[PDB]
């Protein structure tokens, strides 16, 4: 898979695999297996997890 876009300014834009929309500054969480980034609501995260908790996306959690 590929969820990073190199834009016309030379920057990287991350796309949430849950909704196929970019990071827009709202809270995101990064998968500690595959390194994709998801918007919190797209993965049911409703409050910040403990800092020491690893988070795994739906794809990786079943692997």
């Amino acid at each position: 898979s590929m969820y990073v876009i190199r834009d016309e300014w030379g920057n990287q834009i991350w796309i949430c695999p849950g909704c196929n929309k970019p990071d827009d500054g709202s809270p995101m969480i990064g998968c500690d297996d595959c390194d994709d980034w998801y918007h919190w609501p797209c993965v049911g995260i409703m409050t910040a997890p403990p800092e020491e908790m690893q988070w795994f996306c739906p794809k990786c959690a079943n692997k």
């Binding site: 995101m28 990064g30 910040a48």
Partner: peptide, 7 residues
């Protein structure tokens, strides 16, 4: 977990 946010 690793999180990010920007106003």
């Amino acid at each position: 977990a690793r999180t990010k946010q920007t106003a």
